[PDB]
Amino acid sequence: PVNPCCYYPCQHQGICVRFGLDRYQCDCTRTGYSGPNCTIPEIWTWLRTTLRPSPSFIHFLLTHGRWLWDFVNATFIRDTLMRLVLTVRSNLIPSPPTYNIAHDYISWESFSNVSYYTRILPSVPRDCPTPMDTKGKKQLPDAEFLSRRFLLRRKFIPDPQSTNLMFAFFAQHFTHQFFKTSGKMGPGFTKALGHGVDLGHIYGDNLERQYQLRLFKDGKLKYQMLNGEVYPPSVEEAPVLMHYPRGIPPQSQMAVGQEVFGLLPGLMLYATIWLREHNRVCDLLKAEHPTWGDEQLFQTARLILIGETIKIVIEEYVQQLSGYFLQLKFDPELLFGAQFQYRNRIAMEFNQLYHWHPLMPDSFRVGPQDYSYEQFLFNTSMLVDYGVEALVDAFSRQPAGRIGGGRNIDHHILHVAVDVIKESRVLRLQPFNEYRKRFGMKPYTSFQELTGEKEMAAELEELYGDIDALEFYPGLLLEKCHPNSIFGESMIEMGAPFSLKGLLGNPICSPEYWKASTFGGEVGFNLVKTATLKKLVCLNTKTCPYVSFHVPD
Amino acid sequence: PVNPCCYYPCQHQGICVRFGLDRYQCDCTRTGYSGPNCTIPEIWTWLRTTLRPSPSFIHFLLTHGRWLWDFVNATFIRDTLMRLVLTVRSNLIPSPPTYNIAHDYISWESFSNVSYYTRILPSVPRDCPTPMDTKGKKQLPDAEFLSRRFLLRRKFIPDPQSTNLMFAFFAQHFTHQFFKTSGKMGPGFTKALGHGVDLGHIYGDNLERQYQLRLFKDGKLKYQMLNGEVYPPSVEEAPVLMHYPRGIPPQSQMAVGQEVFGLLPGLMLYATIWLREHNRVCDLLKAEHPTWGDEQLFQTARLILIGETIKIVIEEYVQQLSGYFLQLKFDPELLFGAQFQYRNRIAMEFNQLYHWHPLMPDSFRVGPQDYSYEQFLFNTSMLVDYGVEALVDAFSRQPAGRIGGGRNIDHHILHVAVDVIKESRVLRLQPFNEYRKRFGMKPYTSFQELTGEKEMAAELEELYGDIDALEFYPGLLLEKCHPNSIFGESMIEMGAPFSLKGLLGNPICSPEYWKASTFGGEVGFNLVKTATLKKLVCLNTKTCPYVSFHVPD
């Protein structure tokens, strides 16, 4: 017989449970609905469903009406709407986490073993006719052909919203502290056991590497001096595992928390910036605490860099990414009234969703020079040659690519987009419409409703055969964008819940930690509350370059 | 200079932070008070302080007035007070956890490394004059002399509240799933990384041992048949590390989740009962789910045994321990309105606090036979000889010892109480009065106010020199008891917050897990909601003996 859970009968976060040989039951508990399919709405849910404006309309209100938002930002309505964004979006992510690659049900092993990634929806069952359930073809399109035909950049499409490569390397640096997929254990497994903003891309994902990176004097990290400037130390001075070209000159390798940050100059740029910030904070703490040993000067400075990381990513990173006239705010006290679990567990869908390789340009313009991928990838001297001031200045002027819309990935890194499609089939992710229904959206009825477009949609209808068989990552990238925006509807309504739940589920946002004694007094606590990326760069440099998440006018 | 934090200046959960060379500041954030010492009360805190009845008066209301509580238990007030018990006590435990043996401050390492135990108050600083801070003698009393003079049983003092040895072996079995102190790593470190009711004393504290114990058929655990009765399997059949006498006959060893459960017959009694329960639940799930594999039948049955463990410990274990006419209730839905973190981290003070060795009798009466410690400790055939029916029947009739009051530990196990005092000095626990102030109680002004007694109090005043130098564990055990009760005030107000936070901080109590689909439908979910210890015994036996947490009339 056919597995009935292949039909995805349970609506609105209902739980399909097989009974007997061939039957099933949906668990409608606290879904807001009742009935066999969990489709009979309750009274409050019906009222809030008919009074619910569409996400595109909300994007219209938040991106227009500048006279209104100048009033909203100057009053308490800013705090009210910020609390609304946080609670409504993070309510949509399960905490405690539910499933993983091993278990399509709730288990103690899925809870306690943090080596897994979690997942929002279950896998497609093994006994389904179609690889995506019941609708579609008996085999799926070629990932190389989908990437070549629909995701490959032909002409560079710049982000209309003004996004930097300073933004894009910040997004690669920031997201690789909780995206470390284990090559040994396989897909669905992670080495980043913090599952969030722990800065394990700076201090290491385990304790032994952390002690290999620490100076053990004044709480500082180890470092080396080149041309009078502070850089991460050599692997000869900090002997820990760093991926590099086989046959480099170590004594020119640099040791940082993330094993792969040597492979790109912008990633080692940010690692240099944060290391300089760590030791500056250590100087500020030691001035105020002469009695502290090495551990307390270290751990409190780590908490300061964690806090100012979340400050910068909410009020500048997500601010630039949203385009909102509403000025976003990082205040953990906004959640002190609600029931909010201060935990995070990285989802595999959220790993699929941060493949923002369209941000990468055709070439890397640094002043008068223009470097190709072969000149930029794996390059080891460009950081020390130009300096952090000059690479921040050059990356904050070059435009980044638009994420959504399709057909904007360079061919040098298009292979990544290929593997993430193939990995999406290994992990048995559900169809794109099922993730739209899970994150509060209506499924698409046709491919041309997806793309807003005639050619690609019809060729996709030849490849997939049904809209209900479209895969997750191609659906996120081939979706139509909101007008003059970085990406489209599904990247909004799926990416924001994971990202904000990951930012305020950090325990430093809890009532138990969010106080001045945690950060060594009012000095470090105002370092968290006052952090910009301009202060992250220009306080750790000799000159202050142009530093921003957007291009200049 | 003298460390000012040695004086413990910060009151009401204030945080002592050293500034400069010799000064300090208290962090009064969300303490309810303000001022330099955090002693100036706010308006609401003053109102709730003057309107706060004493804990002894609350114990009087909860243990008397049977006509009133017969009305309360039949109405919604039972649900109201239970919510009040849960929210008020667990609010007193920090979640996320704060400190550990390494860090007397908040750190990311204290958060993420679950190998540590946590601690509620910081350690006594190393630069204090007195080992307990500032008040007391330059060295502390001999732990062997305190145990011999004040904790050693002379005549058996039975619990006036009626407590079984079925209770006491349940308390030893239950608490050794989150009390596994690492001999390799030392004090302050634990092997039980679940930090709560994970049943790792049944399924193992790591995954490899878990697969060594699983049958991998129908989700069951491995087992062996002796005299027609189901027992845990031999180590020859389940080859995993089990502590036993060097030179036993394995093929008569039994393999269970906890490495030390072979050393006592009552611990292996409970492990036998829970193993029979696991495979019974596997039969019930397989009847309803013919399609499930081995993993889902296993993990959901584990969640059923976790849930019915918490049901039994709240509505029978803590019920018998309290003596309340208020009938306690396990309903996680009581906390769905509040802000409650579904996490637990075992504290070292709570480890100090569950040393209930006074419960153990002078001898172990089994029917007509009466076994000594040398006949009962390490004995390997008594379980299979009498059977679980007969040992449950015999343990539910023999009285257990009163915990509080002092002078009630048998000499066979008095050495444990010695080491836990010495360990209390290794961990640098603060004085007993400081934990009274931390858990919402006034400190004692004298030793005779502590004991309600003349002789022991004066000899303690010769040994310690000041009431403010009394240690934690001796203060808990030498305290006066509430009238006709198992122990005294400080064991109430310290033990209940850890214990209830540990019971409902389990993620199965969260809104995300507490539903029927988690337990495989209404069958297992009613197995959680209907579990008694009589059902835990008599459904897994041929005959139903007397099974209770209290002696018969």
Ligand SMILES: *[C@@H]1O[C@H](CO)[C@@H](O[C@@H]2O[C@H](CO)[C@@H](O[C@H]3O[C@H](CO[C@H]4O[C@H](CO[C@H]5O[C@H](CO)[C@@H](O)[C@H](O)[C@@H]5O)[C@@H](O)[C@H](O)[C@@H]4O)[C@@H](O)[C@H](O)[C@@H]3O)[C@H](O)[C@H]2NC(C)=O)[C@H](O)[C@H]1NC(C)=O
């Ligand atoms: C988070 O989860 C992951 C994934 O679950 C964990 O990583 C995996 O851990 C697995 C177990 O440690 C491991 O799988 C094993 O599978 C094969 C086959 O397993 C055998 O199991 C029993 C064992 O029988 C043995 O008995 C004797 C006793 O002494 C042994 O010497 C002898 O070798 C014999 O096999 C057999 O009954 C059965 O038939 C199988 O033969 C093992 O051989 C493997 O070596 C492996 O241990 C798996 O590889 C791990 N990795 C992955 C990617 O799955 C991870 O540990 C967990 N994290 C935490 C913190 O718990």
Ligand SMILES: *[C@@H]1O[C@H](CO)[C@@H](O[C@@H]2O[C@H](CO)[C@@H](O[C@H]3O[C@H](CO[C@H]4O[C@H](CO[C@H]5O[C@H](CO)[C@@H](O)[C@H](O)[C@@H]5O)[C@@H](O)[C@H](O)[C@@H]4O)[C@@H](O)[C@H](O)[C@@H]3O)[C@H](O)[C@H]2NC(C)=O)[C@H](O)[C@H]1NC(C)=O
């Ligand atoms: C939870 O926390 C606990 C407690 O912190 C963790 O358990 C402990 O982990 C510690 C580190 O893993 C371990 O302490 C070590 O102490 C010293 C460390 O000194 C090292 O460094 C110096 C100098 O640097 C050396 O480094 C290079 C590297 O290649 C050497 O070759 C070279 O010789 C150079 O000098 C040396 O003096 C020293 O040789 C060390 O390299 C070591 O001597 C110890 O052996 C140990 O490694 C501690 O023992 C652990 N246990 C306890 C009870 O503290 C636990 O890991 C953590 N859990 C998690 C999950 O993170």
Ligand code: HEM
């Ligand atoms: C020159 C620029 C870049 C290069 C060379 C590059 C290269 C790669 C490669 C080779 C992988 C491994 C894929 C696989 O093993 O199948 C990867 C994964 C990934 N990429 Fe990039 N990428 C770049 C830019 C970016 C940017 C700007 C982001 C921004 C978010 C990003 C996000 C990711 C993520 C999240 C992963 C998954 C990591 C993991 O699973 O551990 N990439 N990238």
Ligand code: HEM
């Ligand atoms: C015949 C009965 C008992 C014996 C022989 C016994 C023996 C021991 C021993 C030898 C230790 C180790 C102490 C050390 O290494 O310093 C210990 C620890 C402990 N005992 Fe028992 N005990 C008994 C009864 C109980 C009971 C009924 C309880 C009920 C709660 C209990 C609670 C504990 C706890 C919580 C620990 C700490 C465990 C750890 O830190 O890993 N004991 N006991």
Ligand SMILES: *[C@@H]1O[C@H](CO)[C@@H](O[C@@H]2O[C@H](CO)[C@@H](O)[C@H](O)[C@H]2NC(C)=O)[C@H](O)[C@H]1NC(C)=O
């Ligand atoms: C719940 O969903 C299932 C599957 O979507 C529905 O089952 C289908 O019902 C139609 C009409 O009776 C049948 O023609 C199909 O054969 C059914 N499919 C399966 C797999 O059972 C079911 O009707 C829905 N529940 C309700 C109340 O409408």
Ligand SMILES: *[C@@H]1O[C@H](CO)[C@@H](O[C@@H]2O[C@H](CO)[C@@H](O)[C@H](O)[C@H]2NC(C)=O)[C@H](O)[C@H]1NC(C)=O
């Ligand atoms: C890595 O980047 C450095 C930039 O310092 C490259 O070296 C420069 O190359 C450009 C043109 O290729 C020259 O105009 C500069 O004068 C060079 N400067 C130095 C200091 O060498 C280097 O070629 C890059 N690596 C690779 C492999 O291309």
Ligand SMILES: *[C@@H]1O[C@H](CO)[C@@H](O[C@@H]2O[C@H](CO)[C@@H](O)[C@H](O)[C@H]2NC(C)=O)[C@H](O)[C@H]1NC(C)=O
């Ligand atoms: C806060 O607590 C500290 C310590 O209990 C108080 O400081 C003591 O004050 C007395 C009274 O003058 C002195 O004799 C001691 O020498 C002080 N000790 C220390 C370590 O400073 C302090 O007075 C309290 N704060 C207030 C406002 O009373």
Ligand SMILES: *[C@@H]1O[C@H](CO)[C@@H](O[C@@H]2O[C@H](CO)[C@@H](O)[C@H](O)[C@H]2NC(C)=O)[C@H](O)[C@H]1NC(C)=O
């Ligand atoms: C372990 O317990 C068994 C009981 O099952 C003990 O054996 C009994 O000993 C008593 C006297 O001590 C006899 O009256 C019984 O007839 C014995 N029964 C059996 C089946 O042998 C045994 O002695 C205990 N172990 C130790 C070391 O004392």
Ligand SMILES: COc1ccc(-c2noc(CC(=O)O)c2-c2ccc(OC)cc2)cc1
């Ligand atoms: C995919 O990675 C991310 C990261 C962050 C967000 C995110 N978090 O909060 C907000 C504000 C909000 O919730 O609306 C947004 C957002 C919203 C609209 C928007 O339009 C382009 C861009 C970003 C979303 C996805």
Ligand SMILES: COc1ccc(-c2noc(CC(=O)O)c2-c2ccc(OC)cc2)cc1
């Ligand atoms: C030390 O180990 C424990 C374990 C459990 C509790 C505990 N948890 O909830 C309640 C009810 C309550 O909160 O009052 C109690 C309790 C209260 C009074 C009481 O008098 C003898 C005995 C137990 C306390 C300590």
Ligand SMILES: CCCCCCCCO[C@@H]1O[C@H](CO)[C@@H](O)[C@H](O)[C@H]1O
């Ligand atoms: C008028 C300005 C309102 C700002 C509040 C916006 C935050 C609410 O955001 C809402 O989150 C839901 C769940 O993720 C989505 O389903 C909705 O489409 C989206 O608008």
Ligand SMILES: CCCCCCCCO[C@@H]1O[C@H](CO)[C@@H](O)[C@H](O)[C@H]1O
């Ligand atoms: C209360 C003030 C209401 C002003 C009406 C704003 C109209 C916004 O209209 C929006 O335009 C978008 C395209 O640009 C569409 O995609 C949205 O569905 C639509 O609601």
Ligand SMILES: CCCCCCCCO[C@@H]1O[C@H](CO)[C@@H](O)[C@H](O)[C@H]1O
């Ligand atoms: C240190 C901050 C103290 C604030 C809360 C007081 C701590 C003790 O709160 C406890 O609540 C229990 C709930 O029923 C009562 O039974 C106890 O009498 C009471 O002591």
